[PDB]
DNA sequence: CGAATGTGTGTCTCAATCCCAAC
DNA sequence: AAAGTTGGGATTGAGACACACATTC
């Protein structure tokens, strides 16, 4: 998984009736006013890679004035060159897919399966993994368990082998039906061999699925996964300057604190402190797999709830950071412009917005 | 028959800790490193950036160094300043804090040419380049060059990092540096001085103890300012001293048994000021340590209680399954080749 | 709701192993770095006058060391001083609730029970009206329809009528047992002044649904909206922002008009919903500016705000009038120049330590 | 003997979130100090809310300072006092007054004058919020029981008197001392009348801040004073009002088709681009949009086209004895006997 | 101590909505 | 041919309810 975003351009995409961006590696800071236009993009991002669903109404992302919508975007992912383009003219909609210059899809559901088929990432986990949302940072480590883990499986790339799980399921099931077809059917006898052939050979198969199952190697890597993750985890966190003698992490993932006279949870903390552990987490999984799942990040506001001091020490956190090859950031704070490699200026002319970025 | 100052990377404003007394260690040390200046009485102060810690200072961080500028230009003594990585604005119409020093401060974007006792020496510099305009740095460089020619002494002022001093963020490489008497360099903390180029590149240290990986140098070379001999139609390492200005001490103890208890509380006496001490120290050994937080400043110590393919096959061949066969199939799968003319081979040839 | 806090003392109460904080009429600002003890403050009273739940759990609020938890909080509210004491020992917990000096209530129960019925407020309703957390300052914006009427309700002060509507209920149908002791007789000249009574409670009835929700509640909210939309573009418009009018519908729903288009709360910015969050509740104070003198608090409002509308917001609080004590916490200096008392709130070894500048 | 009583710069205003209603305040500080240099005044009194805020950026501290150095340079003695804006609030952090230290006298206390051969009074202090009332009230008998020897005397503060700001007034009229002159400041109205056998003035603001000071500038032109103390007293006569040129403001309540004509033929006789604000028609807005470059901006609104009285109405509008609904009312709320009441008025006033 | 409580949680449902493809 | 019409699919909100956790008599 090396995946790098390159640039977009939007037409009519809410605030946006027309823009073009580019993106760099490294740190990007999108900055501007309150609703001068900086997540439309990344909702832009989302609705190319994602077509509309019911709750993402055309209404909703259309110019209200406007009645058509398009986006391209342009991305690489394991080294590979990516075009989306989605439309929406005046009651229909189109998407097409192209992969180093030639089209691979060109209808709308084409489209979503195969973006489905490249990221490994659905609609539901893209938002827990790449593209962290408002307050969302940590909203993952007080999440519902079997939610938890089961976010926590794709930022480690292990949901890879969930994938290898259901798909498995597909080979068991029409082995199966390879039985079916032969049960239903002075010369005789050779099948006989054919009964203990396949069925201890289905039998097997079956044995096989549960190796690639949740509570078999995902949740055994996991484990093998989680001290590194300790480990660096605590060594982020100290940079926050914060009164605790270490940060430890359990098996599933819920975070415990060692205060000198007592331990504390993610129940207890302070929403800042909150803030801290989860960023601290996500670079320490990141940290973990560097090359394994050496994925982009995007964050929509992460210093907001922190104050002026974790601001500025978080920025000299993502100046070392050197695991995630293309971090983008957005603020309406200034601690962030200071630290970062591209600034993006994205101001609003009335309600129409407009980007000029400083490279 | 001249002398100049260079002096480098002085944060004012830095609060580490969000501690006030680290941040008026910094006002103190730069304010000393002010009054060893104004006891020297050198002809040129050249100052190679970061002198402020953030674009929007506190306003007594403005004032000191406002009248610490105002005492040098007062007395006759021209400052040279290029804009630190700290001090650059990155939006538009916001100015820059050294803007407030433009009185008695010459603040280099160019070229410039001095007469002391009688001999003209080239001064030319620009501000921090970020990684991205470097052929633009390059450009202003290579015009450095073509103004030089004439004159056989010439400084220049950067505040960069170069190739073979900084492998994480360097911004410019050794060869990128034309030929210059003197390399007056900046926004590293690490105390540099070497010959390079028939010349001297140095990067003058930082004023106090700013990031925590900067102790490790401030020990082996004191930090503070240099002092640099221009007499000579040449430079040598000879006729440049350095003058340390004194720091807030920093002791780290690893007291984990006894005997590195003694380590702890007979250096904490035998130090200069009142010591900051960070670490890690165990729980059962840290309460009797609590002794000594009049003697120190604060107290930054830990305390203590008390290559997925590999794994894969070794778990499925643990579990009593061909790992082989879960590994290639798992290849198999992730791919889109046929499922199908993989199993169909091992259910036929290699299956019991 | 004349509510005003008065002072609080907090004992091993989370971060606060001890604390005395003294309250004033005005804008009230805690200040302090992140975890240093300012939220915990506003738990502690939320504890005071609700007792702990399952959501309040004891070795949450204790302090992790400790084994023992006690709070005092005096208020006014309608001109009478009231003091709440809550305190958990070993095992068994107690309190206290004196009433101008001498005791109240002595029970647990008994203290919860006298609270809601002079606050006119329950523990949930409280924390979509005087409390406001992190974050949940749009929450009243997007609550369920049913909720949402529910706790304008409160917040206009209509909910009092149907106190009366259901003390109706007591007294209608007091009346008309005086009219079964006819009635349930009259089977098995001054035969009209049978049909007096008769009538009269027939007349109990509809003054009954004069104080019903469709009756005049429906009628005076219907009249309110008006004003709230009029003083919610009042402060709306005061963050320069770039929309026509904001249209507020009878459900307390909000419509932003843009000029080519009409917007609602979904799509506006995290930004731009705290400003119409804020300047609704706003217009809510500023509607019955002296008719319902209530005092609010704030947990980091100008969070998801930028610089220039952080201090456009300070300004705001600094005009407004209808709110006698509002107490706003925040990690940003924007409304430290605002403030009349300014607490400060440092931590040094996990415990908190408060320090009051009036 | 002359000298200039100045107020409420508010260097770093950013209006409207707008570069130009920033840079507009430069302008006209600016233009301030041009205008008191090309004067050459003997004093400069300046009496608080020089700067918008206490960490104010780096060009208008580079501007105030430029400024007030041109103005030490000429030999002008400058006297502040902090304003509210400018009271450190916090620990460790400056003023950003305590840049100008060395050209400007930061009034906490007494100072006197010689202006060719007479001594003259001066005293001022910071601003004193409403608590801090009797702190202050000490401060100013201290500056009466230092001030009897002098014929001249002024009095520099940044407070709100009680019968000029009834809102937020944090001292009275009959706490301050006899003194000729009162420069005083944190009200934008420019206020000028006699008190106390002497002269109370507020210079008021430099530059329209709040939107209510635009209906002033056209009415009392925004500026300083120029006070002319050569006389042994002060008088009304001596004083006079400099005016600056401000960002100009036009009004609109565009409701009917007579209010477009009033657009034009004002915008344009007006000094330069104005800011209009107001409410337009919705029908108006895109025949109004042909001039959009002969304005500034246009903060303009588009338009579309007690209970205890309400509820007797409500009450007779739905056939029923209002004055008996809102007694019952009173009668349950307060808990009183609901029955007592209740049983005369089937006795009584019935049907 | 066990029952009465509200408080939250996980999960399940009918129902609506709106995108998306097809005739 | 063209235009709405129409069912497949996905998610979401409100409404139910057993299963816990913890306070409190
Ligand atoms: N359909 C639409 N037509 C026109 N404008 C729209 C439409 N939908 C949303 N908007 C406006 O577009 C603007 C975009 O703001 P956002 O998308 O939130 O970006 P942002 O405010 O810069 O980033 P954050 O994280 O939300 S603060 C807002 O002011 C919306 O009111
Ligand atoms: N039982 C406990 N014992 C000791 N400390 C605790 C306990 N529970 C929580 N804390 C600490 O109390 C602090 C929480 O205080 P808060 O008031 O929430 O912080 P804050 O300053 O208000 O920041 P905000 O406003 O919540 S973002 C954190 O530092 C917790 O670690
Ligand atoms: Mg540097
Ligand atoms: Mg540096
Ligand atoms: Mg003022
Ligand atoms: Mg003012």
Redesign the interface.
């Known amino acids: 998984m090396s995946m790098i975003l390159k640039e977009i351009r939007m037409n009519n995409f809410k605030s946006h009736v027309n823009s073009r961006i580019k993106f760099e590696k490294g740190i990007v800071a999108i900055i501007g006013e309150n609703g001068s236009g900086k997540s439309s993009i990344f909702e832009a991002v989302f609705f190319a890679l994602f077509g509309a669903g019911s709750n993402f109404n055309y209404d909703t992302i259309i110019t209200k004035g406007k009645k058509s919508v398009y986006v391209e975007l342009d991305f690489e992912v394991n080294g590979n060159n990516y075009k989306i383009i989605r439309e929406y003219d005046s009651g229909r909609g189109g998407a097409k897919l192209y992969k180093n210059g030639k089209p691979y899809a060109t209808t709308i559901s084409a489209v979503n399966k195969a973006v489905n088929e490249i990221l490994g990432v659905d609609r539901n986990m893209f938002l827990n993994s790449i593209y962290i949302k408002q307050g969302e940072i940590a909203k993952f480590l007080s999440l519902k368990p079997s939610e938890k883990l089961e976010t926590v499986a794709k930022l480690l790339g292990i949901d890879e082998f969930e994938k290898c799980y259901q798909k498995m399921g597909e080979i068991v099931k029409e082995y199966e039906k390879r039985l079916e077809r032969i049960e239903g059917e002075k010369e005789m006898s050779n099948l006989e061999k054919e009964k203990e052939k396949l069925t201890k050979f289905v039998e097997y198969l079956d044995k096989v699925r549960r190796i690639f199952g949740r509570n078999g190697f995902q949740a055994y890597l996991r484990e093998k996964y989680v001290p590194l993750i300790q480990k660096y985890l605590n060594e982020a966190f100290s940079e926050f300057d914060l009164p605790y003698s270490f940060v430890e992490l359990t098996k599933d993932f819920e975070v415990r604190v060692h205060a000198p006279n007592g331990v504390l949870t993610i129940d207890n903390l302070s929403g800042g402190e909150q803030i801290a552990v989860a960023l601290s987490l996500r670079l320490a999984i990141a940290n973990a797999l560097i090359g394994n799942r050496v994925e982009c990040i995007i964050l929509d506001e992460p210093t907001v709830y922190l104050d002026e001091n974790r601001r500025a020490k978080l920025a000299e956190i993502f100046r070392k950071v050197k695991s995630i090859p293309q971090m983008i950031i957005i603020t309406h704070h200034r601690e962030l412009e200071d630290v970062a490699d591209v600034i993006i200026n994205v101001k609003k002319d009335g309600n129409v917005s407009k980007v000029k970025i400083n490279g | 028959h001249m002398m100049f100052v260079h002096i480098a990377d002085n944060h004012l404003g830095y ?1 580490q ?2 501690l ?1 007394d680290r ?1 008026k260690d910094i006002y103190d040390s730069f304010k000393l490193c002010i009054k060893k200046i104004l006891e020297i009485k050198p002809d040129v102060v050249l100052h190679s950036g970061d002198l402020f810690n ?3 200072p ?3 961080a ?2 000191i160094a ?1 009248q610490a500028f105002k005492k040098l230009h007062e007395n006759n003594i021209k400052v040279y300043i290029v804009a630190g990585n ?1 001090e650059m604005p ?2 538009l ?5 050294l ?2 020093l ?2 008695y401060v010459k603040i280099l974007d160019g070229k410039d040419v001095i007469n002391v006792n009688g001999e003209e020496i080239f001064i030319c510099g620009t501000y921090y380049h ?4 470097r052929e633009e740095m390059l450009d202003k460089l290579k015009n450095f060059e073509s103004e030089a020619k004439n004159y056989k002494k010439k400084i220049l002022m950067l505040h960069q990092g170069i190739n073979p001093y900084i492998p994480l963020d360097y911004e410019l490489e050794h060869f990128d540096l034309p030929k210059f008497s003197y390399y007056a360099l900046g926004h590293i903390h690490k105390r540099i001085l070497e010959r390079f180029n028939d010349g001297i590149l140095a990067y003058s240290g930082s004023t106090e103890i700013i990031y925590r990986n900067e102790y490790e140098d401030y020990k082996k070379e004191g930090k503070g300012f240099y002092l640099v001999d221009f007499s000579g139609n040449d430079l040598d390492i000879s006729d440049i001293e350095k003058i340390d200005i004194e720091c807030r001490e920093f002791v780290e103890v690893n007291i984990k048994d006894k005997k590195s208890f003694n380590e702890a509380v007979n250096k904490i006496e035998r130090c200069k000021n009142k010591p900051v001490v960070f670490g890690k120290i165990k ?1 059962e050994f840290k309460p009797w340590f609590d002794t000594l937080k009049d003697k120190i400043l604060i107290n ?1 110590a ?4 008390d ?2 393919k590999e ?2 096959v070794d ?2 061949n643990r ?1 009593g ?1 061909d790992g082989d ?2 590994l290639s ?2 290849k198999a ?2 791919n889109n080749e046929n ?1 199908k003319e993989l ?1 169909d081979e091992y ?1 036929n040839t290699k ?2």
Do not use: C, T
């Not at chain 2, 119409?93 to 804090?97: L, Q």
């Not at chain 2, 970020?130 to 305009?133: D, I, M, N, R, T």
């Open positions: 609060r800790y969000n006030d941040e953030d674009l929007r506190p306003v007594k403005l004032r406002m700290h990155r939006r119409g916001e100015e820059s804090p803007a407030l433009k009185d970020k990684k991205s305009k729980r930054k830990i305390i203590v209680d290559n997925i794994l894969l778990y499925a579990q399954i066969l879960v199939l798992y799968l992730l499922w199993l259910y299956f019991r």
